[PDB]
Ligand binder design. Sequence first.
Ligand SMILES: CC(=O)Nc1ccc2cn[nH]c2c1
Ligand SMILES: CC(=O)Nc1ccc2cn[nH]c2c1
Ligand SMILES: [Zn+2]
Ligand SMILES: [Zn+2]
Ligand SMILES: [Zn+2]
Length: 459
Amino acid sequence: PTHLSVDTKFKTEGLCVDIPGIPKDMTYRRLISMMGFKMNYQVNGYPNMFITREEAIRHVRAWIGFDVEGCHGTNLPLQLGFSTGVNLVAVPTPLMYKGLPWNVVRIKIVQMLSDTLKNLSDRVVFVLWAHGFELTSMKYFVKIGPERTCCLCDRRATCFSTASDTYACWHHSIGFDYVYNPFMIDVQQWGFTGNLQSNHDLYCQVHGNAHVASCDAIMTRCLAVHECFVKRVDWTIEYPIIGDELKINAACRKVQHMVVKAALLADKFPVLHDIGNPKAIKCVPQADVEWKFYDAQPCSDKAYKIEELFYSYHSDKFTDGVCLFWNCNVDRYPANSIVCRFDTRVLSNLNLPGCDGGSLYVNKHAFHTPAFDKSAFVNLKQLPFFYYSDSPCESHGIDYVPLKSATCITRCNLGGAVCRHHANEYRLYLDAYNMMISAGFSLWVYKQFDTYNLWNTFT
Ligand SMILES: CC(=O)Nc1ccc2cn[nH]c2c1
Ligand SMILES: CC(=O)Nc1ccc2cn[nH]c2c1
Ligand SMILES: [Zn+2]
Ligand SMILES: [Zn+2]
Ligand SMILES: [Zn+2]
């Protein structure tokens, strides 16, 4: 059951307004033929243009919502909309382009998909709410065949050029005019009652319906993300490394240890309440503090209400000592908190647009994160950058320029001059810090936090 069988049935009720008289009995095999494509009994890596819900989830980075609305179809101009916000008008002679023939439209399609996807995925998955015109328009910009490799590199081919008769990946397709071996999934096959807008609107208020094709394309991808990552969650699906995943995760571990260790030294809390990851390990193993864990899986729909996490009868007194919320998204943090909250607004190669203001953060696993809300942090302040170290000033073992910084909290800086070891360690920590912030993470701390209290931990 690796791929979707072409002999699987396709429900055609959603297609009968654009395609009147369409047979109720229909397979993927007959549908692909009707779309103007011939598979020719080919056992060459592309068994079906359509993929399963499971194959779509594994390739969520390739998702591009796609919708076609008739402006007037052979004789009528078509508005092609994409979840990138692009609308192209194809004549058969929220960006909006005037009517142009297919030979030029197809060039823009390849450019747009290559620019959006080259740093996300090795393919494209057209996410549909199929009504007919999107399927019958595919023959105008899509070519299919055996699985091929790029002419300039080892990646799989996603584009084709009729000018040079060659194939390219998303990185080497400039001047290419055809989308080659794309994938697609019709969301309507999943079993829904009512139209696209009524299902999308049940879960999302951030996307509206301006009655343009890109609005429907955006709503379609959003509904698919809601079904696959919000109501249904799967943390056993691994996703390939496409960027700074390892560095970001290593930086997050360094920053957490640094910030918690300093908070414990500066304010000497007798107890720490560690809320979140059921598999968490103490991030400051040598700390004196009474470490107490509370299990909460990552919330993928709405942020946790602090009243439900803490109340309904544990030290019971979460007001004692400090609360650590490391990527545990709550509606309103208590004043005695140390917090790391992912900022969904920072779109990235890792961070894909999500449902209802939220975002799909994909780093090893897929994590749909509720929309960032500045009001969650009203009892706290932004944590300032600082580097703290109690390790001995000793080199052991890249060159040197003397470091001068008021935020290098070390015995050597207290004593007047930062040693080479702490200067190297400071610069590496600052790099890790900037990496985490730029990846989208935001750090918040209790208002009384003051690094001035760390200088006296050198006595
Ligand atoms: C920064 C940015 O625009 N990201 C992005 C990534 C993937 C898709 C799919 N549809 N719209 C998208 C947008
Ligand atoms: C150098 C150092 O002490 N680092 C550190 C950082 C995080 C964790 C978590 N568990 N043990 C840790 C140790
Ligand atoms: Zn290439
Ligand atoms: Zn939406
Ligand atoms: Zn030093």
